[PDB]
Amino acid sequence: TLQDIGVSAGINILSAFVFFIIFAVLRLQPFNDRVYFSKWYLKGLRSSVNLDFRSYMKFLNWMPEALKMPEPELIDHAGLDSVVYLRIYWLGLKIFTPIAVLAWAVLVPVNWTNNTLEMAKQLRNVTSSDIDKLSVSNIPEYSMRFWTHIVMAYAFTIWTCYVLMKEYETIANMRLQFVASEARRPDQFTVLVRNVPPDADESVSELVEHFFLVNHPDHYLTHQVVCNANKLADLVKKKKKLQNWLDYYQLKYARNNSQRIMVKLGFLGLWGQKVDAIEHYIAEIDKISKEISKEREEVVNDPKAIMPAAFVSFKTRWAAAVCAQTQQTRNPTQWLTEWAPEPRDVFWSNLAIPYVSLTVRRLIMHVAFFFLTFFFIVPIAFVQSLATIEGIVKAAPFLKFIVDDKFMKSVIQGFLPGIALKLFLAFLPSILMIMSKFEGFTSISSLERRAAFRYYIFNLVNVFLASVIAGAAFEQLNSFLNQSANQIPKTIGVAIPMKATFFITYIMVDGWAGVAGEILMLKPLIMFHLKNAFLVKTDKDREEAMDPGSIGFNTGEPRIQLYFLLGLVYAPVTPMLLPFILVFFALAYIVYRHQIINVYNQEYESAAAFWPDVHGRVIAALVISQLLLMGLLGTKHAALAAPFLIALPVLTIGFHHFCKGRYEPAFIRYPLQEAMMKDTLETAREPNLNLKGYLQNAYVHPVFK
Amino acid sequence: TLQDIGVSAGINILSAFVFFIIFAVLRLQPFNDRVYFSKWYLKGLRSSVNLDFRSYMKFLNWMPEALKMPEPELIDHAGLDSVVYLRIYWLGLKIFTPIAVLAWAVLVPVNWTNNTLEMAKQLRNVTSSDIDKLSVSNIPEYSMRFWTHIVMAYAFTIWTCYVLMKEYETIANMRLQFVASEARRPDQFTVLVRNVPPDADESVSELVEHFFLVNHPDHYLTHQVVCNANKLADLVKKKKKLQNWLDYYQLKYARNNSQRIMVKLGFLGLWGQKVDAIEHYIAEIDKISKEISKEREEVVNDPKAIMPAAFVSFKTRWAAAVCAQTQQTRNPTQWLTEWAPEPRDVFWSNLAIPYVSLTVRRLIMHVAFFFLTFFFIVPIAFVQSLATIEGIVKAAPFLKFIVDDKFMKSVIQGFLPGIALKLFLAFLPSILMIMSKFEGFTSISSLERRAAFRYYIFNLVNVFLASVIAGAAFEQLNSFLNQSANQIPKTIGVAIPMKATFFITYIMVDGWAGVAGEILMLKPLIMFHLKNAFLVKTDKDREEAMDPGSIGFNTGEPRIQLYFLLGLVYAPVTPMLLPFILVFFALAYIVYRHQIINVYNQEYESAAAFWPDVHGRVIAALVISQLLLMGLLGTKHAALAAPFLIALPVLTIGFHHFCKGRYEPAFIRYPLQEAMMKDTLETAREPNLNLKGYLQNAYVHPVFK
Numbered sequence A, B: 001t002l003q004d005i006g007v008s009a010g011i012n013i014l015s016a017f018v019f020f021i022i023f024a025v026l027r028l029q030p031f032n033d034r035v036y037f038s039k040w041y042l043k044g045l046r047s048s049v050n051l052d053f054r055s056y057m058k059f060l061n062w063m064p065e066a067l068k069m070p071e072p073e074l075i076d077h078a079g080l081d082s083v084v085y086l087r088i089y090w091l092g093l094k095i096f097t098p099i100a101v102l103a104w105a106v107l108v109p110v111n112w113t114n115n116t117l118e119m120a121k122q123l124r125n126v127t128s129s130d131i132d133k134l135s136v137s138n139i140p141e142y143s144m145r146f147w148t149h150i151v152m153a154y155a156f157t158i159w160t161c162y163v164l165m166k167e168y169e170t171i172a173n174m175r176l177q178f179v180a181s182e183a184r185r186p187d188q189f190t191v192l193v194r195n196v197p198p199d200a201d202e203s204v205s206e207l208v209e210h211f212f213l214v215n216h217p218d219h220y221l222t223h224q225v226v227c228n229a230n231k232l233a234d235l236v237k238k239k240k241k242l243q244n245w246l247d248y249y250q251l252k253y254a255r256n257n258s259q260r261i262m263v264k265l266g267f268l269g270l271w272g273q274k275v276d277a278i279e280h281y282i283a284e285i286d287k288i289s290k291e292i293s294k295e296r297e298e299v300v301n302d303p304k305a306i307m308p309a310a311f312v313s314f315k316t317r318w319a320a321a322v323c324a325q326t327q328q329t330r331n332p333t334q335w336l337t338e339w340a341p342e343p344r345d346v347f348w349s350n351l352a353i354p355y356v357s358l359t360v361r362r363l364i365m366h367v368a369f370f371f372l373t374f375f376f377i378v379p380i381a382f383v384q385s386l387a388t389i390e391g392i393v394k395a396a397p398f399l400k401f402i403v404d405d406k407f408m409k410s411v412i413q414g415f416l417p418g419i420a421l422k423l424f425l426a427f428l429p430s431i432l433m434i435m436s437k438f439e440g441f442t443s444i445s446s447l448e449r450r451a452a453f454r455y456y457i458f459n460l461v462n463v464f465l466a467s468v469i470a471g472a473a474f475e476q477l478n479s480f481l482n483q484s485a486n487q488i489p490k491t492i493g494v495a496i497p498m499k500a501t502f503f504i505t506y507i508m509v510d511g512w513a514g515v516a517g518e519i520l521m522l523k524p525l526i527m528f529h530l531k532n533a534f535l536v537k538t539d540k541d542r543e544e545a546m547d548p549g550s551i552g553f554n555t556g557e558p559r560i561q562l563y564f565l566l567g568l569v570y571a572p573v574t575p576m577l578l579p580f581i582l583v584f585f586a587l588a589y590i591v592y593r594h595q596i597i598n599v600y601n602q603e604y605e606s607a608a609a610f611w612p613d614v615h616g617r618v619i620a621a622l623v624i625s626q627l628l629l630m631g632l633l634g635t636k637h638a639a640l641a642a643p644f645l646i647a648l649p650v651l652t653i654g655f656h657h658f659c660k661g662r663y664e665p666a667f668i669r670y671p672l673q674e675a676m677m678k679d680t681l682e683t684a685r686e687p688n689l690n691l692k693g694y695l696q697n698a699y700v701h702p703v704f705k
């Protein structure tokens, strides 16, 4: 089967190169913009017949320079978020190249010697033609060779810890080098104040003014109070639609006047009567502007519509950090102050939630997520069993009998049990985001981090265990509740080696296909070129998210974390996974890198704040691998193996706490020394400027233009 | 046995009143100071033949006024720490009086009806003469009466939560009312700075000056750097001994000149020669003062003896809170700043520990404490087995054979297996304190909190489980590792009801004897009246801790927490515990209260900072009780009981998180609004004062007078 696994790997990787070579269709085809190639439009890098000269690019024109770019240049090119979200793949490569080489060179000799040693079969074809069981399953039960495996785990853990520390430090520095060296972010001068207490007869702005004038003098440039502006929101959306229509009309008329074609409201007939179709639109523009002026200034100064919150902006980064990192009032749930996110980041929907409501919602949704993940299968199984092809017979399917069906469509109709499951798994990121938004979090970044954690846990349970143990998740939970605390590692560890090869197959299929497509799939082409004729036109109306808002940290960090888990679990047990997984990282660190160059924007941007999240998951996967190896070595009766492999997770958790205490605070909480240096430098560079004008207009709302 | 339990309770409570009546020996005996009665000496309330007129106090002269005192008066009398440490007993009373009355009035009827209902035996002696099994053990297996028990648990939990919230709020307010209304605490203006980084050629004081002048301007009154002054410490101790000797000599000479008795160094003979014994002592006083002046000023300004730390004192409470609650430098483990404890509180021994050393020590001692608690019995069993009466035979015990022994001493020689155990349990608070100090914590209060947590966990495991399950703790851990996760509650809950009566006996003996003695025991009299003739004299030389430094929060909070555990576990199962335990609380809330009046000082004083610790333990004990009740009701096959009693702990933990998020921050981290009001009031009251002189002398060291 070793020959078979080599051949299957070759076929899959050759299909990978085939997708990479159909990637060489762009820049030869007419209009040469299949991948939207946002490079000049990503951050407006220049925004605002074709028979010869092929020149045979041979994909050499993109392959090396995705590596040939300075890294600060990449940071300014895309942002610290995306550079770190590629440094995650680079990290994974750093974990699994030395582990791979050392694991092979030490285990595989020691591992594959049980039959005999120092023989003449090395030159024979039996060297590389037998079963691919040069894994821990080859060693007899009580042989001392198992000791080697033990030490390898230690080494691997230590090595992983090394990079996980070094890596961590690196990203920390980068975030700091991001905050100190940047150009005029309003969020550095602003603090979100939440849950101010009601007063008898005093406007909320009056409360905030008095409170932050008494308690934060010498500072407190200004403050913006928040409000529920729903009418203004729909009106400005209508204004944006009208603006798009007017721009389209003007462009068409300049392209072709058509003797002043006046067509409007022709669908309704008598309504509109198609008077002028130009003066009409400017009429709605003027009208909309009128009620926005009339009501925009009215909603701000009225009660029963001003929820308790504000974005207080200060005169100094030092002062803003001071107000953000302290608590103000005797009640720790009143006058909450936190570092204001980027104005783009803010989640304006959840700034009016009392503390008791927060706690209630968090408990409700923790229970709900538990019930979701552990009773994953019951409702979808029920509905799929209800959705039967024989039970769907009705008057309409009379023309849709088996006579015309089942030809090329029978695959989907027979795979419908998989269709319902795939439907739910496709909605799952959305369910996790909804459950995150319900428990108010106020910042898109925190929403994404919470959804990433929920997805990580759900993905762990379902994918990992349902791959390793029997089918249903709730019965698996019941069984694990009815096994000893010393039996769970034993059963999962003993089940690992047979699923080794299935995990090899999953790595190739899922990971390799994902990265191979990720350069360009059906989906981006079929959305963009269809939206070409669907929404407005080819590419105008820059109020749109067809170009991806952000490469998913919500979705995608959990997947590569799962691959971390596979790599760490199978390093001491069956190292045959360990080369294949490497290739995935390799290709990933290419594709997404090049992808980060060309087609991804930033929906928000918060200084790689998510990294401690990732680091915690890597430590968790490492501990899981150590526990499963301890269980497996417990099953295959060895020397004292439970003590070593149970003391190792303790050391891993201790190192995790060291990292969580040392480098982690730099990702949430802004040092005073850095603020003081930046403020002194800013005063030296620009000795005069009106900060008030630049500040008290960035945290109003997106609706208030 | 119900008659037997009533009689035993009567005997124990009558012995309690007998100890309370021998408590009526003071104030009739000559010199009437058996209990040292520190009331006038506790905080110097006035510091600096006897045949008729007995007047028959009849312990009515202390019994009511221990309740008849305003509570702010008590706070100023002893401190917020001790008032809260009595409010813990008051809390316990508030938990267990309504639970007691409602549990009796609802359960005991419903509980004791299984044989039949609406009978004529109520007037018969069988009403209150049978076995005391009107407990949950009386109800048949599948009877729906168990539902009642379920709801009771809910009610009890809810009620407990109620007080635990209300209580919590109350103490929070008190701490705030303590900090805002107080007279000139230096700690309110000072922040402990730790782990400053080394510099090439710059004194540590220079580093701190520059750092806090650049980053904390408009503030930073001064700073005190710390040092290792060991020689100065022993020299000043010798100075204190010499001062005591001189004071004793002067007092004796004034009492009796004895023709100028000149006796000194008479033990050595030729040494000293007893020249004058007065000019000699003033000579050592002058000499000691000389080298203290010479070396005290030299050790401060030299390297290799100044560890990285300082106590930076500011110009405003607002500024001090700002510096305490923020982080300064890019490295979160460098330039650590925390609210300075009281100068008395500071643990000067652990202000020079890098972060990596802290983490290493914490892991080492977490592992060590685990091994201590779970292998509690092995070494002491080994040493006791080695210490045999027959194996101790030697040349010395020739005169100490059985001929003269075993008469009245055979009890101890046969109880030696208990003697070794009791010895270890007596040293256990000291071991916990040592293990707390090893992991540097910088503040006596934090040392006490950590030791209290360690004692709580150890006490839980050993006392509780070894009372409920079989003997050895390590074999108990092995068994619990080899039982299912669904079997631990089952086994402990089923073991609860038979140990109910043993817990009744433990409550009377241990708790009642402890509170009964706690008014006055053998130990305080035999230490004080012996120290009368041992150390110096009756009561002079006020450099001594014979009067207790502090009523033990280190030791004693864990014990009454264990009693909380007993009360919460046995409310739905066997309510017969529940009156008896009440009495203990009652007597406790008297004795310690009166005790807090008369004989306890404050070794340190930090604004009842330990309360969230206590609240967390109460929530933990509540959850443990709910789990054990779920296990018991699982054993006695009832209606669906696992769901209700497993959803209840989730709600308990959620409420605990709500409390931990709302009221808890007020106990560690000083609000800015309160600081601003206090500073404005202080400026208004005293518009002029030199803060520098009052500040830069309180955080130097105790050695630098």
Ligand SMILES: CCCCCCCC/C=C\CCCCCCCC(=O)OC[C@H](COP(=O)(O)OCC[N+](C)(C)C)OC(=O)CCCCCCC/C=C\CCCCCCCC
Binding pocket: A407, A408, A409, A411
């Ligand atoms: C060309 C020279 C002669 C070739 C003779 C071949 C005869 C084959 C037999 C029947 C053909 C008609 C089949 C009718 C319905 C098929 C039922 C069926 O079983 O279908 C699926 C199968 C298997 O594929 P799958 O299940 O994995 O699904 C695709 C999934 N995915 C997109 C991810 C790759 O495939 C198929 O049937 C076969 C797929 C054939 C079509 C491929 C795509 C064609 C696109 C353009 C054709 C020209 C259009 C011009 C439009 C101009 C407008 C202005």
Ligand SMILES: CCCCCCCC/C=C\CCCCCCCC(=O)OC[C@H](COP(=O)(O)OCC[N+](C)(C)C)OC(=O)CCCCCCC/C=C\CCCCCCCC
Binding pocket: A408, A409, A412
């Ligand atoms: C080259 C010479 C040979 C020429 C052939 C001539 C004779 C045969 C001609 C036609 C017979 C077609 C045979 C079967 C058609 C298959 C329909 C079908 O495959 O449907 C299901 C698929 C969706 O399932 P999926 O697994 O592929 O993607 C799931 C997700 N992913 C993206 C991950 C893969 O959807 C789809 O293919 C969308 C298909 C419809 C698109 C619009 C068509 C234009 C409007 C009307 C024309 C006829 C309408 C028929 C209505 C039925 C459409 C379903």
Ligand SMILES: CCCCCCCC/C=C\CCCCCCCC(=O)OC[C@H](COP(=O)(O)OCC[N+](C)(C)C)OC(=O)CCCCCCC/C=C\CCCCCCCC
Binding pocket: A400, A404, A423, A426
């Ligand atoms: C005879 C009886 C006729 C009855 C007439 C009834 C009236 C007409 C009614 C309906 C007809 C149209 C059916 C529309 C089907 C499209 C929807 C669909 O299909 O729902 C399956 C998936 C949906 O998306 P999702 O579940 O993945 O994610 C969803 C969520 N999210 C994005 C967050 C991850 O979509 C897919 O699978 C789509 C991929 C389909 C691939 C198969 C292609 C068809 C095969 C050959 C055609 C060859 C053309 C040659 C072209 C040359 C040009 C390059």
Ligand SMILES: CCCCCCCC/C=C\CCCCCCCC(=O)OC[C@H](COP(=O)(O)OCC[N+](C)(C)C)OC(=O)CCCCCCC/C=C\CCCCCCCC
Binding pocket: none
């Ligand atoms: C290739 C397409 C061919 C279209 C031919 C249409 C010919 C005329 C017949 C019907 C016209 C209505 C067509 C409706 C299907 C559109 C195809 C489709 O791809 O749908 C896409 C939608 C959107 O996808 P999204 O959730 O990811 O974006 C929302 C969330 N965001 C923004 C974050 C991404 O997905 C959905 O709604 C659910 C998926 C679609 C399920 C369709 C069920 C149709 C069955 C019976 C007919 C029902 C009434 C039909 C008439 C209605 C209009 C009058």
Ligand SMILES: CCCCCCCC/C=C\CCCCCCCC(=O)OC[C@H](COP(=O)(O)OCC[N+](C)(C)C)OC(=O)CCCCCCC/C=C\CCCCCCCC
Binding pocket: none
């Ligand atoms: C009637 C009026 C319009 C009707 C409605 C049309 C609406 C549909 C529009 C778009 C949707 C689908 C486009 C997909 C067609 C491309 C096919 C392709 O991607 O092929 C790849 C596969 C490779 O084989 P496999 O191992 O995956 O086995 C088959 C899969 N399994 C293993 C599961 C059985 O081959 C195959 O599909 C098997 C087919 C035989 C080999 C290729 C046939 C020639 C293909 C295209 C002709 C040129 C098109 C020019 C126009 C382009 C402009 C759009």
Ligand SMILES: CCCCCCCC/C=C\CCCCCCCC(=O)OC[C@H](COP(=O)(O)OCC[N+](C)(C)C)OC(=O)CCCCCCC/C=C\CCCCCCCC
Binding pocket: A534, A543, A544
């Ligand atoms: C000449 C011969 C005649 C032949 C006749 C047939 C020819 C074809 C006819 C028409 C083709 C029109 C082509 C355009 C189609 C566009 C498809 C589309 O636009 O796809 C995407 C949209 C999502 O919007 P967006 O992200 O682009 O907006 C952006 C969000 N912004 C505004 C905030 C930026 O998808 C959506 O429309 C949302 C729909 C989601 C569906 C979920 C399932 C709903 C559940 C039950 C429905 C049951 C049926 C009853 C329906 C009653 C109400 C109609």
